[PDB]
Amino acid sequence: GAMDPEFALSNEKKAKKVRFYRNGDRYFKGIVYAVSSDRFRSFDALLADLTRSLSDNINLPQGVRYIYTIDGSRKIGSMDELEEGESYVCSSDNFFKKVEYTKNVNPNWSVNV
């Protein structure tokens, strides 16, 4: 029958797929996370989940306090700056390390739809 399906009968496209990397890892290809208005009310909420998901008590003391651009030129403050299939770096108290965050890496992560 069909009373009330959760997620298996027609669904609109929303949110944004990003590959999150933790500043200073190199070997770590990062973790993919989805972001929208229904999941995260703001960057602060994302950072909350990011801290827990990317937590490593190594290069990320408090998990994740801020999110920087793949280059680290500027840190994002609003979700409106996060675009689909985007690559971000997690920062807290570091000067951002310019590594092969996506050099020679398979960018087929943003294609699981």
Contacts of 52 (CB under 8 A, 6+ apart): 63
The three-state secondary structure class of 31 is: strand
41 burial level (CB within 10 Å; 0-12, 13-18, 19+) = exposed
Task: Dig out the tokens for 45 from the structure.
Answer: 């909420």
The three-state secondary structure class of 54 is: helix
Residue 57, Ramachandran bin (φ over 0: left; ψ between -120 and 50: alpha; else beta): left
CATH number at residue 101: 3.10.20.230
Q: Pairing mode, if any, of strands 66-69 and 75-76?
A: antiparallel
Task: Dig out the tokens for 71 from the structure.
Answer: 């280059």
Q: H-helix or E-strand containing 21?
A: strand 16-22
Q: How many domains would you assign to the chain?
A: 1
Look up the domain containing 36 and give its range: 1-113
Is the separation of the CB atoms in 19 and 30 below 8 Å?
Answer: yes
The three-state secondary structure class of 5 is: coil
What does the alpha-carbon distance between residue 59 and residue 91 come to, in Å, rounded to a whole number?
9
